[PDB]
Every structure is written in structure tokens, then in C-alpha cells.
Amino acid sequence: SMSVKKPKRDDSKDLALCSMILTEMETHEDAWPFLLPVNLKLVPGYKKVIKKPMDFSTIREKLSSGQYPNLETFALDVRLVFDNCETFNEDDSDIGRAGHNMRKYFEKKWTDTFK
């Protein structure tokens, strides 16, 4: 509350560390459904159904330009990429399985780096 604060967690390396995680997600062999925005002209149903599209390139641009106020807003956009994928793709598809694999990979890196 006013003039009463928990001890200051060091957040000075968060930008760099989120960049490294994002590099490792970019270079994973199952990243290919997630590298670029879904083409809304060429994928019937996507625009109407997926209210907030998100992809790795868009997270990279937001990160590089100071559009994440903190490390949690960064994790929300990463998770959004996988929630969107589950919304549109069957579990038993190459893309559906890719999404599950990447989400696992992300959550471990996140825990090991920050928890």
C-alpha cells in the first residue's frame, strides 16, 4: 500500500531473457505454423473465429519496440499463439500436435528462467 513495498525483484534482465526464449521458440523445428501471421485472405473462417491473432514475428516486433510493459504481458501473447492454434486445429493434425509441443517447450523454459 502507500509507502509499504515488498522487496524489489530485479527485472533489469527480463528484456534480454524474453528475447532469448523467443529465439529458441523461433528456431524449434515445429515452429513453422507460428512464424508468421495466418493469412486472413486465404484461410476461410480465421478472421471471424480468432478474435486476436498472434504469431512469433508479431511478438518479436512488439518486444523490439517496447510494447511489452512487463514479462507477464510477454507470456500472455506467447500463450495466445497456442490457444488460437487449439481453437482452430484438431489435436490429431500436424499443426495441432505442433501447438502442443511448442507450448510444452515454452512453459519449461519459462519456469526454468524465471520461477
Side-chain angles (χ1 to χ4, degrees), residues 6-7 9-12 14 17 71-72 113-114:
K6 292 205 185 55
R9 188 205 165 249
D10 185 11
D11 69 344
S12 64
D14 289 356
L17 284 159
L71 88 170
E72 300 309 328
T113 302
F114 294 116

Side-chain angles (χ1 to χ4, degrees), residues 10 35-36 40 44 49 65 77 85 101 105 110 114:
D10 185 11
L35 294 177
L36 301 176
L40 299 181
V49 167
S65 63
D77 264 359
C85 183
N101 287 352
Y105 189 72
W110 190 254
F114 294 116

Side-chain angles (χ1 to χ4, degrees), residues 80-113:
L80 175 62
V81 169
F82 310 126
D83 298 346
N84 290 347
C85 183
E86 280 195 53
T87 297
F88 210 80
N89 293 263
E90 276 292 342
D91 295 345
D92 189 10
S93 64
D94 294 272
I95 290 168
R97 279 186 287 279
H100 288 293
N101 287 352
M102 295 299 310
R103 181 193 300 269
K104 188 88 179 175
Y105 189 72
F106 170 69
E107 289 306 346
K108 164 110 154 71
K109 304 277 187 187
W110 190 254
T111 296
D112 295 351
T113 302

Side-chain angles (χ1 to χ4, degrees), residues 9-12 14-48:
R9 188 205 165 249
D10 185 11
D11 69 344
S12 64
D14 289 356
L15 189 60
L17 284 159
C18 288
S19 182
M20 287 167 60
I21 294 170
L22 178 58
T23 296
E24 295 164 0
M25 277 195 311
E26 292 165 335
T27 59
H28 192 295
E29 72 158 290
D30 302 338
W32 58 265
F34 313 115
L35 294 177
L36 301 176
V38 172
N39 181 339
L40 299 181
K41 300 170 201 292
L42 304 186
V43 176
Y46 209 83
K47 188 172 205 296
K48 184 64 180 272

